[PDB]
Scaffold this active site. Structure first.
Site, short mmCIF file in Angstrom:
data_model
loop_
_atom_site.label_atom_id
_atom_site.label_comp_id
_atom_site.label_asym_id
_atom_site.label_seq_id
_atom_site.Cartn_x
_atom_site.Cartn_y
_atom_site.Cartn_z
N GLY A 174 -4.36 0.30 -1.51
CA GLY A 174 -3.32 0.40 -2.19
C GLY A 174 -3.46 -1.21 -3.22
N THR A 175 -4.42 -1.34 -3.84
CA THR A 175 -4.24 -2.28 -5.16
C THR A 175 -3.29 -2.29 -5.85
OG1 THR A 175 -6.63 -1.69 -5.00
CG2 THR A 175 -6.43 -4.00 -6.64
N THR A 176 -3.00 -3.26 -6.82
CA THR A 176 -2.33 -3.75 -8.12
C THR A 176 -3.44 -3.51 -9.60
OG1 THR A 176 -0.17 -3.31 -6.80
CG2 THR A 176 -0.51 -3.56 -9.57
#
Lengths: 245, 243, 205, 215, 238, 213, 103, 259, 215
Positions: free
Chosen positions: I10-12
């Site tokens: 669930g990275t950016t």
């Protein structure tokens, strides 16, 4: 073997002699001698050095491509004596095994384990009939995290012992005697001291004074664990230091 | 002499020699001379392709192969093994372009093919290849690179070499040639001269000279020498031989 | 419906003082219909060693037969009677060999050490999860009732005869509250001197 | 392929006297998001064949790699033979049909242009393997929006010139941009003629929004 | 050499290893079988009456199926392997076709197995000759003989093993329709043939009797001795 | 999900005669509610005495036609003779049943002269079953075309009528009329009508324009 | 037959785990090393497997394990079910003929 | 031996040819459960090494199956692991990796590294695509210093000073977030882990029974199985001691066993 | 209760290329559903000495792919005796993702520096497609900063300017995206080396909230 097992005791790898010796392994050693060169490796308390004579036969031959010093991984290097193609094949196999060890175990392969794997493969070669032992010798060097510098030589029979000063090639016996004499006299064994010991041992056994282009030197130190190939200028500087004293 | 040790490639002689590999080398020596000279701009090949009969169409049994857009191949020894190894090299280079997206370096391709040959020499089920070839390529980063592979499985770079019957004479001619300072045109002219010099018209009735080069003038792309330049080189070789 | 409830079954094992007891029901039936009132769920795996399997009858028989195969080979190779812990490990390996499609049975092993004569009881899961407890182990479609009875009745260092009384009462009261279990109870009391096999009277309903 | 993921909008092709011209937008959309707005969905197969794809861009890259490798190998052979555009069309049809039969199809609809032996070729290869040749082609929403205009013009004038074909393709691109949510202003005109395959740079459409003020 | 490899053809055109398997067959004990009207009988001459040995475990006549029998002469282990394979094939045929196995079918299967083992030089041929005899679906008596090479032939009366030639001449001289008509006549013929094979006879006779719609049964030494006494009395009368 | 089959339309029809075997089909390739192309005949000639019509999923039709051509070449190479119409029909049945669990979505009608010079029409289903008929219609409008063929060629439900042998010109007129009706009532037909007449002299191709959508 | 369809999605993967691992190793070598390494390893494996016990007898495959790098690695494959304790053994000649490709 | 038509040699490895039975049985009506352990395992990295913690309750469904279960598994003399999820899966995974690490150490002759065990565990779990339910907390003190990992069933790992796993993991992790200090003392780390395990025990139904501890350091390995006993059974008031003759029998079979 | 959730990063992830290197950045939050399994994770996985990668999607799948690509790239670099190219690592990632696109989900962008082409940034989203971008953003929280990066990105940005831009965009994403959070981890790769910094607390750029009094 697909072609068929040979008749004589010394004509096949598998079948034994009346004493029980395997003559094909001994002939592989004779092939290592047939390689024509001599390699000397010296272990110190700060670095490990491998020195072998570089003989560019023809002027047209590109001296850059002529080398027996290969790096298995970033921290482990080797010098190969014997058949060139067999040595290259063993180098490739060692590189693949080291990469697989790094991938599977999460840390760089030790030198001892690398030679253990190589010697196991060599034993497999000497046991079956289809294949033949590789006519070459592998000398691995590298700095261990806890044991410090490590020198291991790695032979067709499947012997993977480690040494304080390794020799291999045509003049293996004389180089071994010289290195035993030097080791009996325990010096400080500094980096330049080990390089000088290796170079002078090779010169003594070959009865020739090397110029910068006649030898190739690879070193690996505790401070700099990366396998480093000495530049021809550095080899010339070491030779000049030897000549002066 | 390995009288009882020269039947299999997996058998060592008492002195430590595998005589099958040496017999493969001799088989290579049985073939006509193929020379290749590396210069600053690129690599130029040249082969003394003997014509066995006038019936054969010009170009039959070509000894120069384009294994890649930028890699040439001058072969000697058995022709069938040469074609097989050329196909192997083509597969390797195709695979490198497909995987890493850029042209395979000459050194890496030479290593791959040499190790293939060595693997073939390792076992007794198969026999060592009876051919020797020269891999040459030119690139803007890599530069002019020439490599030769022996049936044993070696891979050594050269500034100039020859393989075949008159290997030593061609080698001496290349030795007394100063390739590092000449352009591709002079190099191809001298290659034609050397090929004509080493050709023995007595034993060998006739031959056709095939010339190919890769370099900056070809934009790092192996190709056959144009017919005009090839004819000029042949004329220069004729004049040199006459005097 | 649950696969265990297809054939029913209820096996219990308890530990006493230098003695072990194992009991099981004798009902075999497809879903609700009864077929026989003599089905065997306890199998001898040695002199002082028994294993009781509860669950799908066909899986029970298959596991018992394969375990006997492995046990016979092991005893022939080693030449010694197997230890209860080794039998538990063998059963766990056998069950985990079929992990992704399991043998629908939860064996319980009860026996004395062939050398030390120390009581040993254990229970296995669907996929072979060892579980050794000194008090008791139960398995079957009436696990809750057996657990309650064992917790309420079990005492440390039980006299063999009174250990039999306790285990028999627990099994009877547990199976009397289960529809797919009952129709008689078989109890084996294993001691170093002898082994007593007893069949109890129970509601045939 | 099972999830199209980054997709292509549409490829329009039409054949004129002297060659064929195809056009495609420079957009690869993940969902409704534009994301990649500079990719090229047109490739040059050889000197007489061109190719444009609409669908999964990863599959388009895979086909690019495969076709480039085949062309390179055939050039290495140097026997004087070249893959005609019809041969490439047949090969692509076979590959797509095999992938469909394996229940793992490539999710691209391919338009194949070419000009060999003085004959314009314009091929259509679908995901399943439906293959045919038409004077004009259009994939995706092209078949609904641009194909009408192309077909009307062609059935009116059977043979067009290069300028006429280019103008018609530009009008079709304008219509698609007006009435397609997955379209993009920047497109790429690629034309193949006797000289060879010529791929033009990024071109934009002449937008018009007077009807916005009309209301 | 030519005689060492099974696959190698001799210059004359012989596969000498198959002929050596035939010689191994000849080394075996004599087995004799005749054909009669609704009566098929087999007989095997025991090499020696070895004391302290169970005769049941060294029987030479076995039943491939309820309607087919077989006797062998050669290597015993190869015979056992071939017999097991023939029984398996008989059951497989009774499964797939649902009909009782014909003598032709099983003889063909055995011949095919032997030939397949003669195919490759890695596998040695089966060194056995088999006398497959039995009744077909319609009840017609059938006698057959296979060879290590893989060739099967129907015979009215045959003998295999050591002394096969002399017993074959005996059978040819003393084969008549009248003898075939009477089951006791066929049994007496086999006893006489085996007694010609081995002078001692008596306990050395291993005779088995199969009749129409009747399973294979081996006559006990009592019945064999009774038949030997009958033959002796007939000879004395002359 | 992924659907390996789509319906591309197309109608095929074959009529057998004493010395002719007409194989007619439309040129409408239409997927969904759109028209892929207006020029795609569904009839492909195999030999000088056999023409096959394929309707349904276009990809399967193309693959099957290519396989049939390859098998014809293999048969010619092996038996040193051209395959007969009945042999082609049997081979096509075997091929179709080979992919039984992933059936070809192709309606196949083989029309051509037999060894006696008589028109032979073989109708096939996707699975592979086939039989010899005097006339048959396949594809989208098969149900529309068949009744008139039965009424006219078969003279069915016609009391007190003369069973005149079917002539070539009458067959062509009947084919044109039936396909015109199909174009009128079937949206998958129109554009053009490719008529392949298989006679002892050869195969003649005739194109008749139909009304567009 | 319905046996061709895997009963479990993981079953097909783990049934050919060794074959898939060898294929992946060959693919990696061939990507990086070249054609020589996979061919060499294939010949080596063929040579070691050519010499072993007959099919009806369980083989050790020590040299094969050493070449494959599994001589010091243990997985569920080695422990869960023993090929020695087969519990199902066919006719010796039948198994030999099956391996030879005759059946 | 076997009976007719056995051609292929036995195939070593898992046997999945048993799920058709499962499908048929489920189609007939509506699978039995297995011990999921309802675990609360936690570990911390203090100044000198690693402290691991676990509970001793194993739950089958919603009924307590084992009231004293060892959930801290031995991997090596310097490396230990804690298991959560399917009990048998964690047990077998830990045992297999422990045997592999023992072989690796025997071959190398040096103490195994935590990174090696983590790599083996994650690679195997990824190979099995998370079908093996093994929620693992891996901790040890190798030559490179203390290391703590949290390996998920699908094959994802993470090196953190403190990790929690299992159904009661959230309470333990809240306790950690509240009362965690960098470079704790041995007693402080033990107390923190014990409080986290106790919070998980008293706040999660699946967790309960006793508290397990395992202190790993470069000097000593301290495995404390009965570290704490928060919950215990109450005293039994009434006696239901069954006397002889209470139960009626039908058959008697006395079988003496030779000694 | 809250299990059976595959741990997704669930990275950016963000990578910006400057003159002579590339600036990498990502958050440090991994959420198993809605529970934050790890809040200080390291999403920047080094592939080589001067090549890094950013992992988005399933944690296990990205980790396995990164490990395999690292092994392959190390072996390749040893074989070639040259520093590996960023394009080579990107190609390896693309091949691995495209081969198993239906088996694993992994949105990985690769940035690094090589002697030949200098700083490069490659993006390999789910599907197995590879394209070079001046700046690439991926992950769940990348959707909330597409407009910001489009508006505030310039040509010829310096190293410090790229670091500030990455920090600002990432911080906006963490503020808006629930799956993104923790601390900002940056890695500026250049010829000299890779220098990594972590921005926490007040170091993370703060943007004024509306804070309308009535609300």
């Amino acid at each position: 073997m697909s072609r068929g097992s040979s008749a004589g005791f010394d004509r096949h790898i598998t079948i034994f002699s009346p004493e029980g010796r395997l003559y094909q392994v001994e002939y592989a050693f004779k092939a290592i001698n047939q390689g024509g060169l001599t390699s000397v490796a010296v272990r110190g308390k700060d670095c490990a050095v491998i020195v072998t004579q570089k003989k560019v036969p023809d002027k047209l031959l590109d001296s850059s491509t002529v080398t027996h010093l290969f790096k298995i991984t970033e921290n482990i290097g080797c010098v190969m004596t014997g058949m060139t193609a067999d040595s290259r094949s063993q180098v490739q196999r060692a590189r693949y095994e080291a990469a697989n060890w790094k991938y599977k175990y999460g840390y760089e392969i030790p030198v001892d384990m690398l030679c253990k794997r190589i010697a196991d493969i060599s034993q497999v070669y000497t046991q079956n009939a289809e294949m033949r032992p590789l006519g070459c010798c592998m000398i691995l060097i590298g700095i261990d995290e806890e044991q410090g510098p490590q020198v291991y030589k790695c032979d067709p029979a499947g012997y993977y012992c480690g040494f304080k000063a390794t020799a291999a090639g045509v003049k293996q016996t004389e180089s071994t005697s010289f290195l035993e004499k030097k080791v009996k006299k325990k010096f400080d064994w500094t980096f330049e001291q080990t390089v000088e010991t290796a170079i002078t041992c090779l010169s003594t056994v070959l009865s020739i004074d090397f110029k910068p282009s006649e030898i190739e030197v690879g070193v690996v130190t505790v401070e700099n664990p990366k396998f480093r190939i000495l530049t021809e200028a550095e080899i010339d500087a070491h030779l000049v230091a030897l000549a002066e004293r | 002499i390995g009288t009882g040790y020269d039947l299999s490639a997996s058998t060592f002689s008492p002195d430590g020699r595998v005589f099958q590999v040496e017999y493969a080398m001799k088989a290579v020596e049985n073939s006509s001379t193929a020379i290749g000279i590396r210069c600053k701009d690129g690599v130029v090949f040249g082969v003394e392709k003997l014509v066995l009969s006038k019936l054969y169409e010009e170009g039959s049994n070509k000894r120069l192969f384009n294994v890649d857009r930028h890699v040439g191949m001058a072969v000697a020894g058995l022709l069938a093994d040469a074609r097989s190894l050329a196909d192997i090299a083509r597969e390797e280079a195709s695979n490198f372009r497909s995987n890493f997206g850029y042209n395979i370096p000459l050194k890496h391709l030479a290593d791959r093919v040499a190790m293939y040959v060595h693997a073939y020499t390792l076992y007794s089920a198969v026999r060592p290849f009876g051919c020797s070839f020269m891999l040459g390529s030119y690139s803007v980063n890599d530069g002019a690179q020439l490599y030769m592979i022996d049936p044993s499985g070696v891979s050594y770079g050269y500034w100039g070499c020859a393989i075949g019957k008159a290997r030593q004479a061609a080698k001496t001619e290349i030795e007394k040639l100063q390739m590092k300072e000449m352009t591709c045109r002079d190099i191809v002219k001298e290659v034609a001269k050397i090929i004509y010099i080493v050709h023995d018209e007595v034993k060998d009735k006739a031959f056709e000279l095939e010339l190919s080069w890769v370099g900056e003038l070809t934009n790092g792309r192996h190709e056959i020498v144009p017919k005009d330049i090839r004819e000029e080189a042949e004329k220069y070789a004729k004049e040199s031989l006459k005097e | 419906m649950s696969i265990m409830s297809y054939n029913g079954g209820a096996v219990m094992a308890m530990k006493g003082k230098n003695c072990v007891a194992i009991a099981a029901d004798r009902r075999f039936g497809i879903q609700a219909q009864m077929v026989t009132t003599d089905f065997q769920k306890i199998f001898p795996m040695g002199d002082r060693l028994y294993i009781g399997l509860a669950g799908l009858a066909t899986d029970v028989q298959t596991v018992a037969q394969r375990l006997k195969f492995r046990l016979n080979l092991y005893e022939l190779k080693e030449g010694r009677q197997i230890k209860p812990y080794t039998l538990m490990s063998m059963v766990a390996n056998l069950l985990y060999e079929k992990r992704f499609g399991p043998y629908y049975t939860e064996p319980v092993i009860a026996g004395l050490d062939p050398k030390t004569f120390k009581p040993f009881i254990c229970s296995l899961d669907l996929i072979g999860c060892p579980m050794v407890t000194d008090d008791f182990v139960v398995s079957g479609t009436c696990a809750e009732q057996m657990y309650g009875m064992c917790e309420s009745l079990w005492e440390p260092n039980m006299d063999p005869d009174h250990l039999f009384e306790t285990i028999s009462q627990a099994m009877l009261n547990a199976v009397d509250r289960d529809a797919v279990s009952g129709m008689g109870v078989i109890v084996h009391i294993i001691e170093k001197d002898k082994i007593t096999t007893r069949t109890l009277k129970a509601r045939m309903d | 392929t099972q999830n199209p993921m980054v997709t292509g909008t549409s490829v329009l092709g039409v054949k004129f006297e002297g060659g064929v011209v195809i056009a495609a937008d420079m957009l690869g959309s993940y969902g409704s998001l534009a994301r990649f707005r500079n990719i090229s969905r047109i490739m040059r197969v050889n000197n007489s064949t061109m190719l444009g794809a609409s669908g999964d861009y990863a599959d388009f890259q895979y086909l690019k790699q495969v076709l480039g490798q085949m062309v390179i190998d055939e050039e290495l052979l140097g026997d004087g033979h070249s893959y005609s555009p019809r041969a490439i069309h047949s090969w692509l049809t076979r590959a797509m049909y095999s992938r469909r039969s394996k229940m793992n199809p490539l999710w691209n609809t391919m338009v194949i242009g070419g000009y060999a032996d003085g004959e314009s070729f314009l091929g259509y290869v679908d995901m399943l393997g439906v293959a045919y040749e038409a004077p004009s082609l259009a994939t995706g929403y092209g078949a609904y929006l641009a194909q009408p205009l192309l077909r009307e013009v062609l059935e009116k004038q059977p043979v067009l010139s290069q300028t006429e074909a280019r103008d018609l393709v530009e009008r079709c691109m304008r219509v698609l941009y007006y009435r397609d949510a997955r379209s993009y202003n920047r497109f790429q005109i690629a034309t193949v003629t006797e000289k060879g395959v010529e791929i033009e740079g990024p071109l934009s459409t002449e937008t018009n929004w007077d009807i916005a003020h009309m209301i | 050499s030519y005689d060492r490899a099974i696959t190698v053809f001799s210059p004359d055109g012989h596969l000498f290893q198959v002929e050596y398997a035939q010689e191994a067959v000849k080394k075996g004990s004599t087995a004799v079988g005749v054909r009669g009207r609704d009566i098929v009988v087999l007989g095997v001459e025991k090499k020696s009456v070895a004391k302290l040995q169970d005769e049941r475990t060294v029987r030479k006549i076995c039943a491939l199926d309820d309607n087919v029998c077989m006797a062998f002469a050669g290597l015993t282990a190869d015979a056992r392997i071939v017999i097991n394979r023939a029984r398996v094939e008989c059951q497989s045929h009774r499964l797939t076709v649902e009909d009782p196995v014909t003598v032709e079918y099983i003889t063909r299967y055995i011949a095919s197995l032997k030939q397949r083992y003669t195919q490759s030089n890695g596998r040695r041929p089966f060194g056995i000759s088999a006398l497959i005899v039995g009744f077909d679906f319609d009840g017609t008596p059938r006698l057959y003989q296979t060879d290590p090479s893989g060739t099967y032939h129907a015979w009215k009366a045959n003998a295999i093993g050591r002394g096969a030639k002399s017993v074959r001449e005996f059978l040819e001289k003393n084969y008549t329709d009248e003898a075939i008509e009477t089951d006791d006549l066929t049994i007496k013929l086999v006893i006489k043939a085996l007694l010609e094979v081995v002078q001692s006879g008596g306990k050395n006779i291993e005779l088995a009797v199969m009749r129409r719609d009747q399973s294979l049964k081996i006559l006990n030494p009592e019945e064999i001795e009774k038949y030997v006494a009958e033959i002796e009395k007939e000879k004395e009368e002359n | 999900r992924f659907s390996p089959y789509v319906f591309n339309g197309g109608t095929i029809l074959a009529i057998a005669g004493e010395d002719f075997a007409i194989v007619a089909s439309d040129t409408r390739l239409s997927e969904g509610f759109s028209i892929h192309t207006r020029d795609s005949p569904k009839c492909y000639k195999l030999t000088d005495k056999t023409v096959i019509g394929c309707s349904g999923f276009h990809g399967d039709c193309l693959t099957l036609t290519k396989i049939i051509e390859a098998r014809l070449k293999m048969y010619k190479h092996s038996n040193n003779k051209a395959m007969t119409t009945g042999a082609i029909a049997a081979m096509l049945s075997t091929i179709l049943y080979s992919r039984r669990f992933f059936p070809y979505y192709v309606y196949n009608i083989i029309g051509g002269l037999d060894e006696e010079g008589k028109g032979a029409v073989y109708s096939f289903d996707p699975v592979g079953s086939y039989q010899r008929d005097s006339f048959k219609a396949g594809g989208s409008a098969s149900a529309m075309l068949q009744p008139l063929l039965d009424n006219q060629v078969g003279f069915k439900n016609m009391q007190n009528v003369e069973h005149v042998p079917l002539s070539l010109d009458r067959a062509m007129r009947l084919v044109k009329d039936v396909f015109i009706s199909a174009a009128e009532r079937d949206v998958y037909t129109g554009d053009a009508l490719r008529i392949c007449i298989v006679t002892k002299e050869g195969i003649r191709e005739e194109t008749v324009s139909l009304r567009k959508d | 037959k319905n046996e061709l369809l895997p009963s479990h999605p993981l079953e097909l993967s783990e049934k050919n785990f060794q074959l898939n691992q060898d294929k992946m190793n060959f693919s990696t070598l061939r990507n990086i090393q070249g054609l020589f390494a996979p061919l060499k390893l294939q010949m080596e494996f063929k040579a070691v497997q050519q010499v072993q016990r007959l099919p009806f007898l369980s083989s050790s495959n020590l040299s094969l394990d050493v070449l494959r790098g599994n001589d010091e690695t243990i997985g569920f494959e080695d422990i869960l079910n023993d090929p020695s304790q087969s519990e199902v053994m066919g006719e010796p000649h039948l198994m030999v003929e099956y391996k030879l490709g005759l059946l | 031996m076997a009976a007719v038509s056995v051609y292929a040699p036995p195939v070593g490895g898992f046997s999945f040819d048993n799920c058709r039975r499962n499908a048929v049985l489920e189609a007939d009506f509506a699978l039995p459960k297995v011990r999921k352990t309802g675990t609360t395992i936690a570990g911390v990295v203090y100044k000198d090494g690693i402290v691991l913690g676990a509970d001793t309750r194993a739950t089958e469904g919603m009924v307590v199956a084992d009231k004293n279960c060892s959930k801290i598994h031995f991997i090596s003399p310097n490396i230990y692991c804690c298991g959560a999820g399917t009990a048998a899966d964690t047990d077998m995974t830990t045992q297999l990796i422990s045997s592999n690490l023992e072989l690796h150490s025997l071959s190398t002759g040096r103490l195994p590294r935590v990174v090696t065990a983590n790599r083996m565990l994650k690679q195997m779990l990824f190979r099995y695509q998370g079908y093996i339910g093994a929620a693992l907390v891996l901790g040890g003190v190798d030559v490179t210093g203390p290391h703590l990992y949290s390996i998920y069933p699908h094959g994802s790992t993470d090196k953190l000073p403190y990790v929690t796993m299992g159904s009661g993991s959230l309470a333990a992790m809240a306790v950690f977030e509240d009362k965690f200090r960098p470079d704790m003392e041995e007693e402080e780390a033990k107390n923190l882990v014990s409080e986290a395990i106790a919070a998980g025990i008293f706040n999660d139904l699946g967790s309960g029974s006793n508290i397990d501890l395992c202190v790993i350091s470069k000097n000593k390995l301290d495995f404390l199985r009965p570290y704490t006993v928060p919950n215990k059974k109450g005293t039994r008031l009434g006696r239901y001691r069954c006397e002889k003759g209470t139960t009626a029998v039908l058959t008697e079979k006395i079988t003496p066993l030779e000694i | 209760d809250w299990e059976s959730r595959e741990v997704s990063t669930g990275t950016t992830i963000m990578a910006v290329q400057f003159d002579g290197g590339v600036v990498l950045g990502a958050d440090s939050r991994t959420t198993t559903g809605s529970y934050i399994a790890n809040r200080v994770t390291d999403k920047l996985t080094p592939i080589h000495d001067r090549i890094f990668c950013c992992r988005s999607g399933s944690a296990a799948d990205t980790q396995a792919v990164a490990d395999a690509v690292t092994y392959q790239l190390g072996f390749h670099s040893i074989e070639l005796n040259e520093p590996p190219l960023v394009h080579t690592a990107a190609s390896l990632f693309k091949e691995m993702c495209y081969r198993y696109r239906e088996d694993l989900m992994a949105g990985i962008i690769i940035a690094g520096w090589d002697p030949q082409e200098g700083g490069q940034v490659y993006s390999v989203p789910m599907g197995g497609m590879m394209v070079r971008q001046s700046f690439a953003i991926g992950g769940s929280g990348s959707s909330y900063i597409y407009g910001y990066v489009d508006a505030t990105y310039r040509e010829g940005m310096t190293k410090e300017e790229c670091l500030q831009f990455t920090a600002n965009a990432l911080a906006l994403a963490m503020e808006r995206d629930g799956s993104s959070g923790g601390v900002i981890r940056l890695a500026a790769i250049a010829e000299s080396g890779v220098e990594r910094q972590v921005l926490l607390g007040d170091q993370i750029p703060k943007f004024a909230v509306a804070t309308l009094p009535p609300a």
